[PDB]
């Protein structure tokens, strides 16, 4: 009972709710005696509309609670309005490799029993496919190196975000997006693969990679992609090619080694932001070729379902086609331009504008606000965790962040049962 909750607290304006703070501060400090904190946390809740300009007060007690909703009332912050009407789940983005990071999971394996769980039922499955201990690398002191290890570990992180945020938290997915590997944990969170059977497919995939590990090389360049293609077929070059569509504003290429590093030299010296990317696989080019038929083969078992949840596909030509998550399905993943923005601009077309990033460090959350810019939108683009930030009360940070920007969310998860208390009521104005 002693232990901090969060409370909920939201108005039309910052000063609006900074007078709204005010107020439940001066009631708080009155009714102290006479209210439980657990029944004042469920009434802001669930018993208040929740409006536009939206905080969050984390206290262990009341006199707590009346310090830092007088630390609210006394600020000059800008609470930023939600983006969302609370009529659509957020979009989890699930990125690719590079957000990796040493004990990247240790934190979240004590703080959130669901995240131990995934990562309990992962780690057999992970030890008969590659071969290695999944809770031993994402706790160990270095970071986890090796196309076969990354791979895996990540995608662990992944679902076992995914899995914390919906029975922990009630957040249920409006729609996923993943961007490369990313779309194997977004296949477990839609339904549309067994969460087994997509450690399988990401297993499997990254041990075939390390076959060809050292082919090539990738390179990010900030040209929109119809003009680095324009360069590519202008410049009588073939071994190279757009791997990756992230933003409007933004492209990655990939194929030889040579080609890549003098494309980036050209482009550095007519001042565009190029930089050479290290892979340890060009991926999303001729470079994976040699092992696409090993690749179907290891994946012909793997048995699709029908997606329950929106899945706007980087992969298909059209994001709006619902995937058929088979064998033929990861090859084209694997091989095929990833076209996240369009998959982002569709999922923001249809009036999705919470996104949050379940990744172990942000990596996408830029070109999700790059692409909301150009659709004249404005949205939210979170990330789920941050490399080395602590995390004591697990995932509730993320909660409060999904709840502050719009998301729709089920309050009963996080606030399951009290009494509807007599607290302040502020005009609908």
């Avoid at 005010?22 to 657990?38: F, G, I, K, M, N």
């Avoid at 997606?307 to 084209?332: I, M, N």
């Avoid at 942000?362 to 080395?388: F, I, K, N, Y």
Wanted: net charge negative; hydrophobic share 45%.
């Amino acid at each position: 009972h002693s232990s901090p909750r969060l409370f909920m607290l939201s108005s039309t304006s910052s000063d609006a709710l900074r007078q709204t703070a005010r107020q439940l501060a001066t009631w708080v400090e009155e009714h102290q005696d006479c209210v439980a904190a657990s029944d004042l946390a469920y009434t802001l809740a669930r018993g208040r509309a929740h409006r536009p300009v939206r905080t969050a007060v984390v206290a262990a007690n009341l006199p707590e609670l009346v310090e830092g909703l007088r630390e609210v009332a006394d600020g000059d912050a800008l609470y930023d309005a939600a983006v969302g009407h609370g009529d659509r789940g957020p979009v989890w983005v699930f990125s690719g490799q590079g957000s990796q990071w040493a004990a990247m999971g240790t934190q979240l394996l004590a703080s959130e029993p669901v995240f131990a769980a995934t990562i309990a039922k992962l780690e057999p499955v992970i030890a008969a496919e590659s071969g290695f201990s999944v809770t031993e690398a994402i706790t160990a002191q270095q970071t986890v190196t090796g196309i076969d290890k990354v791979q895996p570990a990540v995608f662990a992180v992944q679902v076992a975000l995914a899995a914390t945020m919906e029975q922990t938290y009630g957040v249920r997915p409006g729609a996923v997006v993943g961007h490369s590997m990313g779309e194997s944990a977004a296949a477990v969170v839609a339904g549309a693969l067994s969460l087994e059977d997509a450690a399988r497919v990401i297993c499997r995939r990254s041990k075939l990679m390390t076959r060809i590990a050292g082919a090539g090389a990738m390179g990010s360049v900030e040209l929109p992609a119809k003009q680095v293609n324009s360069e590519l077929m202008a410049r009588g070059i073939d071994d190279v090619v757009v791997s990756v569509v992230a933003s409007p504003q933004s492209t990655v290429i990939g194929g030889t080694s040579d080609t890549v590093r003098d494309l980036i030299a050209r482009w550095e010296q007519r001042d565009v932001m190029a930089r050479e990317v290290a892979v340890d696989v060009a991926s999303h080019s001729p470079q994976v070729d040699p092992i696409l038929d090993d690749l179907a083969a290891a994946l012909a078992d793997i048995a699709p379902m029908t997606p329950k949840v929106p899945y706007y596909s980087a992969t298909l030509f059209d994001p709006r086609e619902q995937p058929v998550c088979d064998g033929a399905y990861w090859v084209d993943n694997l091989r095929n331009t990833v076209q996240f923005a369009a998959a982002v601009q569709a999922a923001m077309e249809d009036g999705y504008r919470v996104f949050a990033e379940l990744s172990p460090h942000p990596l996408l959350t830029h070109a999700v606000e790059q692409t909301g810019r150009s659709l004249d939108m404005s949205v939210a683009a979170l990330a789920g965790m941050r490399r080395e930030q602590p995390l004591p009360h697990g995932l509730r940070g993320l909660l409060t962040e999904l709840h502050r920007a719009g998301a729709a969310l089920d309050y009963s998860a996080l606030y399951p049962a009290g009494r509807l208390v007599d607290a302040p009521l502020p005009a609908w104005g």
